[PDB]
Amino acid sequence: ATGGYVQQATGQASFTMYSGCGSPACGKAASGFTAAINQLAFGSAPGLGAGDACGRCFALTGNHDPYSPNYTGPFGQTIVVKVTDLCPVQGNQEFCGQTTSNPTNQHGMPFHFDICEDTGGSAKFFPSGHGALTGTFTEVSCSQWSGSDGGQLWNGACLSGETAPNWPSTACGNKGTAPS
């Protein structure tokens, strides 16, 4: 996409969970299940505001635990998240360090979703004792996502991806150039 960001409606991803998504990089939180996506897919950088991932909805499916490779299952449920947040390259090399010159992370995944724990998404997705997974994702209509958006936290906040057709397309728009 514009800026060199790698924004695909389906593919393979790794998955983790995080706490505290009430002031996220898109500038609006949401009451449903939400996630941060790695910088190369988010479409912005820290401090530059919302990228084109903001507001888009994705079905996520985990099917492998790289830290317990002999674990055969069960895995969690497939969940639908709305992307509200950025998992930046800085401080997240293992999972979110994809760049244009090296577009996969340390688990070989070209995308990463950090699922917010606060609103319940991670409890549906991660079995107890298995907090990092790999698997797949697919962008879906936000008709498949339960919840409501919060109010804007600053000027320029955006979740307009929530009404956009799947990538390739433009809603909030990308900011700057993807990390190299």
Report the half-sphere exposure of 31 (CA within 13 A, side-chain side).
Answer: 6
The Cα angle at residue 58 between residues 85 and 75, in degrees rounded to 5: 100
Buried b (16+ CB within 10 A) or exposed e, 79-116: bbbbbbbbbbbeebeebbbbbeeeebbebebbbbbbbb
Question: What's the longest Cα–Cα distance across the chain?
Answer: 48
Distance between CA atoms of 92 and 97, rounded to whole angstroms? 6
Domain boundaries, the chain: 1-180
Burial class of residue 26, CB neighbours in 10 A (0-12, 13-18, 19+): buried
The Cα angle at residue 135 between residues 133 and 137, in degrees rounded to 5: 125
Read off the DSSP letter of residue 86: E
Distance between CA atoms of 95 and 83, rounded to whole angstroms? 16
Distance between CA atoms of 174 and 36, rounded to whole angstroms? 15
Say if domain 1-180 classifies as CATH 2.40.40.10: yes
Instruction: Compute the Cα dihedral for 44, 35, 93, 91 and give only its sign.
Output: positive
Distance between CA atoms of 126 and 133, rounded to whole angstroms? 8
Question: Minimal CA–CA distance to 84: which of 45, 43, 50?
Answer: 50
Question: Minimal CA–CA distance to 127: which of 35, 37, 64?
Answer: 64
Residues 6 or more apart whose Cβ sits within 8 Å of residue 27: 49, 50, 152, 153, 154, 156, 157, 158
Structure tokens of 84?
């509200």
Residues 6 or more apart whose Cβ sits within 8 Å of residue 41: 5, 6, 7, 8, 53, 98, 111
3 state SS of 82: strand
Distance between CA atoms of 56 and 103, rounded to whole angstroms? 21
Q: Write the DSSP assignment of 1-58 as a string of letters.
A: -GGG----SEEEEEEEEES--SS-TTS--BSS-EEEEEHHHHT--TTS---TTTT-EE
Q: Using alpha carbons, list the distances in angstroms from residue 114 to 21, 23, 41, 135.
A: 10, 15, 13, 13
| Pairing between β-strand 57-64 and β-strand 111-116 as defined by DSSP bridges | unpaired
Q: Using alpha carbons, list the distances in angstroms from residue 15 to 2, 148, 158.
A: 25, 23, 24
Residues 6 or more apart whose Cβ sits within 8 Å of residue 125: 15, 17, 60, 62, 76, 77, 79, 115, 133
Numbers of helices and strands, H then E, in the chain: 3, 6
Question: Minimal CA–CA distance to 34: which of 53, 21, 50, 49?
Answer: 21
Structure tokens of 153?
């936290």
